[PDB]
Structure formats: structure tokens, C-alpha cells
Fold:
Amino acid sequence: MKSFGELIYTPDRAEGEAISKAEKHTPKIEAPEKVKADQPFQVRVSVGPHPNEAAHSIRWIELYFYEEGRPFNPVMLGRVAFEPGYAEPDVTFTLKLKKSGVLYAISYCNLHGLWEARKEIKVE
Amino acid sequence: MKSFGELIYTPDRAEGEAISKAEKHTPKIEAPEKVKADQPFQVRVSVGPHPNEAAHSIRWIELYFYEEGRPFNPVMLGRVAFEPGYAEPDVTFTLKLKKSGVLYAISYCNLHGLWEARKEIKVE
Amino acid sequence: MKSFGELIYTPDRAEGEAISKAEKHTPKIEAPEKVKADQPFQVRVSVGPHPNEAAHSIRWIELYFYEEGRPFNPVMLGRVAFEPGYAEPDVTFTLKLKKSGVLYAISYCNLHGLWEARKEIKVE
Amino acid sequence: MKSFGELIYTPDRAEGEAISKAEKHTPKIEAPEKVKADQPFQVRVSVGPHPNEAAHSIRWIELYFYEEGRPFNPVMLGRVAFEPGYAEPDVTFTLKLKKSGVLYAISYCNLHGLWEARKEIKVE
Ligand SMILES: [Fe+3]
Ligand SMILES: [Fe+3]
Ligand SMILES: [Fe+3]
Ligand SMILES: [Fe+3]
Structure:
């Protein structure tokens, strides 16, 4: 059968899809490569160009984090939901990290499923 | 008895509370007074200074909108949830409006309940 | 102007609406009148009959609680979101209470807004 | 590096974990093996025994569905969030399916991460 984690469009097989000739679902993560510990910084997450209507939109974005050295992983950092037609799939968070790891962005399209983005962030 | 809508701390009786000597829960809405129709703009919502830990944080922010002339109201625009300790209660949305109305921000504190902010926005 | 809490259709002015000739939005709360402290019980929340499609559904239900004697109120107990067309607006929670108070149910319709239901529960 | 989908504890490597000597995180899905199309049925999802407190609980459960023959997958069916200490990680949904596939349950623990359960459902 198939596992849930396999269902997710990784950014590697995100380019060789027929729907990525019309609309990008893979989230774009804007965030500094290095930050200071306990210091606040911005992370922007956005998807586009994609339609935005009742019948077809990015419904929500999930932001997770793999913390290096944490016993279990990942930690979910935030979740934002967008109203189709009113809100663009574009959001800025403010974060404080203690340790290095990887930011993950998950976008959900009501027609096109779950799309993943990854970004390394070091904490010095 | 008491109705749900009465339970919410309005920004009028938000100043005469004993807990607003230690921490502000009333959301701050940053958004243009006037925008063009169908044109995208930023709305920032933030709460602070408030603690941010497992035992005590702003768990989530809801962004709603009263659309003038819409038969029923309001329209929920977005919802963001923050992980205690990692995410600051500070978020930026991107919106497209068609008609004038009022932005509402609702913050939730796990100890201190529901707090409301209001901001008029005109669409010309 | 108008406050957010006033926008919510109470179950009193829920009967004298023109849309309640076609569809009920006011949640139905099924829960025992009295429970024992720290003891688990079921609470069912449902809305209907209402359409359930992409263009028109109950998007989500929020369950809150006014705890008698708690310094601030209310406590949000749960939140469930339903996929239009697949999930019925019908959910059962399991709760443990320590003190008496009032359960509140909030349903959201993407066309028809926010609807409220109230149910007293005693903890002996 | 590692992909997001790999981070998720499958129910296969869920038994050979040191924390499954103290608490089960893998969701239990109760649902009929076969249902009729467009006909409503119950799906119960629960996690336990697990602690339920501010510092440590199942925060939320996501219910997804792989629809056989659907161009893209999966469809998210529902999402429920539980207040630590008040709500048990136990929820019942009502669903209508049109086509056969697989139900997925994802539980989130604030310490122990993401846990997966799978259940085949036929629509005749
Ligand atoms: Fe799409
Ligand atoms: Fe507070
Ligand atoms: Fe309706
Ligand atoms: Fe755990």
C-alpha cells in the first residue's frame, strides 16, 4: 500500500509534474541562513502563481522545524489558513530559535494536495 | 446567563483591566486606511508585550472582516496558530478586497481569553 | 461602529432570520447536564440541515467553555474543521471538567457567518 | 538531508520505539471496511494512553484520504485541535465518500512529533 509521508510532493519531483506548467505549489521560504540564539527574525512563506478562488486555492500553510539534537522531531512552529478569494497564500512569521536545524513548509491545495519546501537555518 | 459575544474583551474595557498593567493582549492591526479594489496589500497583526511559553502564550490570532453591503457578516479572512516558545504572536497577511468595511483581530491567550481589535478600511 | 461580539447570531435572534426558513446554522450541543469532576464524557456538536459543498458549507466548529470562578474566561476546548463535501458538520469530543460552567458552540458558514449555541453543565 | 515525509513515525516503526513502552501515539481509526456511496458513516480517531497536560499532550489530529482514481492526492477530510487538560485526544467524524481509498490519521505530540495510522475503506 502507500504511506502518508510518500504522498507529499517533494521539491525534487515538483518540477517534473504536468501541473507545474500552469501553477507552482512548492512553497518559497525566505529566512536568514544564520541567526543568533533567542533572537527574533522573520520567515516569509508564499506560494504562487496559483489561482485563488473558492473552487481552487492554497487552503493553508504549515511551518515545521527539525531541531538538531532534539530527541524527537519535528516541532510544528505555526499554521496559517487563508480564506479563498480574500487572502493570498503569503505569510510572515516571527521566530526565536535556540538550536540549528531545518525549516519545512507544507502548502495544501484542495485539488492538488500537499507540497513541501525545505530550508537550512543555523543558530550561532 | 451570558452570551459568547459578551465574553470578549473589547478594546474599550481593555484598558481598565488589572492584567493590562503587566501585558497587553489587545491586537495591533497595521493596514492602510484606503486600498484599491482587487489590489493586494499587507495587514500586520501583533500582540505584545506578552509572555511566550508553554504555560502562557498567545495561542492564535483570527482575522475577520465586516464587508459593507454583504447580506451576512463577517467573513473570516485568515487564522494563524503559534507554537509557544518558538513563534512570536506577530503575523503579516496579504489581502485583496472588493468592498469597504472593518478588519477585526481576535487574539487568544490560554489564561486570559479573547481580545478584540478593530480597524476601518476603505476600498476605492 | 459595531463590535465583533455583536456580529454573532445568538440563538434568540436565530429564529427570526429569513435564512432559517431554509437551513439551520445554530449548533446543537448534546452533553450531560451533570458530570463528575475529572471524569470523561462525550459532547456532540452538529449543524443541520445545511448544504455541504465547496460553495457553501459549515467550514468549522469551535467549542469554548465559561468556567465558573476562573479569573478570566472563556477557555477554548476544541476546534474542528470540515472538508466541504466530505465531512458532515457533526463532531463528538471527549472532555474532563473540574468545575461548573457553560459550553459554547460556534459554527461558521462561509456565506452566513457565525452562529452560537449555549449549554449549562454542572460538575459535582 | 532528510525530507518532511520521512520524519513521520509510521505504524511499522512505531512499535520499536523506546517511548512506546510508556505511551502510544499511533492513532486508532475506527471505521467500516465497506460503505455505500454518498451514505454518511462514523469514523472515530483516538490516541492513548498518553498524558494530557499543558506540558505534554496530543495537540491535534488530522484526517486525510487517498481517493483511488483521483488525479492528485490526498484530500484532507478534517482537522481537530484539543485543549490540553480539557479535551481527550478522541474524536468522531461523519463522512460521505464517493470512491474507494485509504483513511490516514495524523496525531501531533508537542514532545514526540507526528504519528501515522492507515485504514482501507471500500465504497460499493
Ligand atoms: Fe492547485
Ligand atoms: Fe496573557
Ligand atoms: Fe449557510
Ligand atoms: Fe507524547
